Amino acid sequence: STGSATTTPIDSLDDAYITPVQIGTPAQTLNLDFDTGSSDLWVFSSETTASEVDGQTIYTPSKSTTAKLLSGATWSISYGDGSSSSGDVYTDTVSVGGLTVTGQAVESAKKVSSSFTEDSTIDGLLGLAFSTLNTVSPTQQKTFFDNAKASLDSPVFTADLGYHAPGTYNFGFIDTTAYTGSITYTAVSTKQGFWEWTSTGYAVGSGTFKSTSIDGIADTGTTLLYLPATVVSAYWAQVSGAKSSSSVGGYVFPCSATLPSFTFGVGSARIVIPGDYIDFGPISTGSSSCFGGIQSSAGIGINIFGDVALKAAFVVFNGATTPTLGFASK
């Protein structure tokens, strides 16, 4: 089997991407944030504290003939950006782009943090990291991909995120028309539960490539590119007037600037992030100070190849017995 679904930016900045997901019988379609940095499929629901629902589409298990309460099971998650959610668990039928899993753990939110309430476009998350990170207790649950894996033509999914435009998540096959050149594959560590890999270095604009190992995670659920302070400093030094602002919470730059590209290494290959991808607009409406799309990972504890990086590539998440990651230009 295979599946193919379109993923759409939630706003003009590509702050996140939503992908339609069918849950239950008859289908209830919710727009979920596919997140290769977490491993819970959770949704706004009929059980969510009413004051914490503001415009989202909810999953109502009682209207699904295939929903079954997973007795005793609860979940609770906190994300790298400080947001959180928790609740109980149903199993139900879940389909993505024509690919169907029966008995998928659907985690029903009773509580969500303000960040989620305030974002009316995201109805929940669909985790695509490794199932070892799943928060369901006392019985840990498998991700959608894990459940689908054996049925897929090939045990892979691919992320093809658009810049200011829709893209595609595919399951079970590699669309050879979706990228240019070759796909370069690189080793993955699953020891922390993430799609963790090591980039071979970077360049700033037309600058010379610096060979250096950068350990990081491929995370579709994170907006920006978070790298070591040395790297980030070298990038923003090439932008006149750019500075790190503690009050704003990272590097800002004059909105009148032309940003240089940023290249990262995948083995011997190179992925180029155009400068425009690194512009996240005025820090506040009407401001001439713009927020940078490359930020320091210092104090996160891990480097994160977020959407800024991933949307510049066609990315293969290979879930073979020994997982790997592939990157191609497009």
One of 39, 45, 64, 199 is an active-site residue; which one?
199
How many degrees, rounded to 5, is the angle at CA 249 between CA 202 and CA 33? 75
**What technique was this entry resolved by?**
X-ray
Torsion sign over Cα 322, 312, 235, 306: negative
Torsion sign over Cα 18, 20, 21, 23: positive
Mapping DSSP onto H, E and C, the string for the chain reads: CCEEEEEEECCCCCCCEEEEEEECCCCEEEEEEEECCCCCEEECECCCCHHHCCCCCCECHHHCCCCEEEEEEEEEEECCCCCEEEEEEEEEEEEECCEEEEEEEEEEEEEECHHHHCCCCCCEEEECCCHHHCCCECCCCCCHHHHHHHHCCCCEEEEECCCCCCEEEEECCCCCCCCCCCCEEEECECCCCCCEEEEEEEEECCCCCEEEEEEEEECCCCCCEEECHHHHHHHHCCCCCCEEECCCCEEEEECCCCCCCEEEEECCEEEEECHHHHEEEECCCCCCEEEECEEECCCCCCEEECHHHHCCCEEEEECCCCCEEEEECC
Strand order in the sheet with 279-282: 243-245, 250-254, 289-292, 279-282
Phi, psi of 26 (to 5 degrees): -60, 160
Q: Is 199 a catalytic residue?
A: yes
Q: Is 84 a catalytic residue?
A: no
Type of residue found at 19:
T
One of 14, 33, 35, 146 is an active-site residue; which one?
35
Q: In the beta sheet, which residues pair with residue 265?
A: 270
Type of residue found at 46:
S
Which domains does the chain possess? 5-174 (2.40.70.10), 175-330 (2.40.70.10)
Residues whose CB is less than 8 angstroms from the CB of residue 200 and which lie 6 or more positions away in sequence, other chains included:
211, 212, 213, 214, 265, 266, 267, 268
**CA torsion, points 44, 49, 53, 56, in degrees to nearest 10?**
20
Resolution of this deposited model, Å: 1.7
